[PDB]
Amino acid sequence: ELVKDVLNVLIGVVSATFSLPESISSLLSEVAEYGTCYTRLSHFSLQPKGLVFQAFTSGLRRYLQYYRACVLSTPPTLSLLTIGFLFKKLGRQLRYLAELCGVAFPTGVKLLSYLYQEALHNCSNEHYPVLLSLLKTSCEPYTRFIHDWVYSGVFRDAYGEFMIQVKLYWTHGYVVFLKHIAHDIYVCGKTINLLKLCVLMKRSITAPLAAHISLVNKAAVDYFFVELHLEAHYEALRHFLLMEDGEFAQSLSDLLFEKLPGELLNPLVLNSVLSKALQCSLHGDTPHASNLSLALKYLPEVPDVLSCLELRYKVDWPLNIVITEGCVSKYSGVFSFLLQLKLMMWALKDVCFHLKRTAMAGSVQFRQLQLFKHEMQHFVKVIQGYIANQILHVTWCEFRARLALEEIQRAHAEYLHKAVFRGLLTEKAAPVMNVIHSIFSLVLKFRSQLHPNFALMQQSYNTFKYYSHFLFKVVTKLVNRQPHLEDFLLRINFNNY
């Protein structure tokens, strides 16, 4: 009858006319060449390189068996033409699966995403369910690795199909699905790995996932405050580095300035002056109060306004990862300025005290002399009042009502950066800082000449009044081009021009 011959070609077994009127051969090739793709699949999807490729390979055999189930089920012996028409709406789909595979071929995520773009490309048509059932199982193992960083945190990779592979401790290199969740997964895992050492709407994935991301991060930040006192370290480093606590800088700087080369630089005096300083603090002497390594960074040789010296805080592991080893370096930048400021309010205090013992001696030469100090002191006691208003109070209002895990890195990087910006240390407003040195220098010369050389000092003060009068113009011209500098005008200029 020949029915059992054509039907035994979709299975792959050869026949009397299938090797490996008269026009029936042409209409036979319409069903024959269908079989050439069925065999061309088992030769390609037989193995049980990549793990996601195996599942997609394991998904194909979940389909062909149905194609083997449909055949040999309905027709015992039907008309010849019935076969060609019955296997048309289904046969052409089998030839479509040849365009998908080879009969090179991506692997890993590159394949799990390539198959996705085949869905939207041919969505409305009848190829939607078959492709979907493949994608629904071709991503099954890939969810498991995603199901590790979310629940357990053990990274299980074999060949690199995962898009992510494996002091600083944050060198798990990272670089389709919605990127709104991609970068979040990368951080939703590193937190767990850090606590261990201490229509195509994708709703079936994010919904069981986003519910767990917010609980981890909230428990991660809460882990820091209520147990490791992150809120304390900030409000403690400010007590020591930014010199917020009086009776400490006025005891440290006051000690060092008593000396001024080979002395004052061995670790016997400068590494001990701190342990004498902390006792006069009336605040501290806690586990926080330690780790104040008063270390130096230069070996100078020999009237100026510079004494290079550093003061570094020290931290331990679960806090080292937040407070960057670069941020503390910038505290050292803002510190050497603030210490340099105290050198004025002590040297200027000296001449105010050095002159006190001189007092009978009342003449025009005397009173006209002392009014210089009153005219120079008021300037420094103004620029200091500015610093003690921006870098310690208002920039601290932010970053204190701002906090209440990635954000902690940026919020801190924004707190200090505003402190060095309002501090006239940025290179943008550098000329405003350069002129300050001319002011500070002249006060030191005024300290050297503690009336044998009055006129030598009278010329010095006149140079001071010129430079100060020059500052009022260079800062004003820098307003048309910084709302931070605005408050300086109201500070330097008041009831004058």
Swiss-Prot record:
Disulfide bonds: none
Domain of life: Eukaryota
Compartment annotation: Cytoplasm, Cytoskeleton, Microtubule organizing center, Centrosome
Family: Belongs to the TUBGCP family.
Function: Component of the gamma-tubulin ring complex (gTuRC) which mediates microtubule nucleation. The gTuRC regulates the minus-end nucleation of alpha-beta tubulin heterodimers that grow into microtubule protafilaments, a critical step in centrosome duplication and spindle formation.
Subunit structure, as described in the record: Component of the gamma-tubulin ring complex (gTuRC) consisting of TUBGCP2, TUBGCP3, TUBGCP4, TUBGCP5 and TUBGCP6 and gamma-tubulin TUBG1 or TUBG2. TUBGCP2, TUBGCP3, TUBGCP4, TUBGCP5 and TUBGCP6 assemble in a 5:5:2:1:1 stoichiometry; each is associated with a gamma-tubulin, thereby arranging 14 gamma-tubulins in a helical manner. Gamma-tubulin at the first position is blocked by TUBGCP3 at the last position, allowing 13 protafilaments to grow into a microtubule.
Pathological association: Microcephaly and chorioretinopathy, autosomal recessive, 1: A syndrome characterized by microcephaly, cognitive impairment, underdeveloped retina and choroid, and epilepsy in some patients. The more anterior parts of the retina, near the periphery and pars plana, have a grayish hue and diminutive vasculature similar to retinopathy of prematurity. Visual impairment becomes evident during the first year of life.
Protein name listed in UniProt: Gamma-tubulin complex component 6
GN (gene name): TUBGCP6
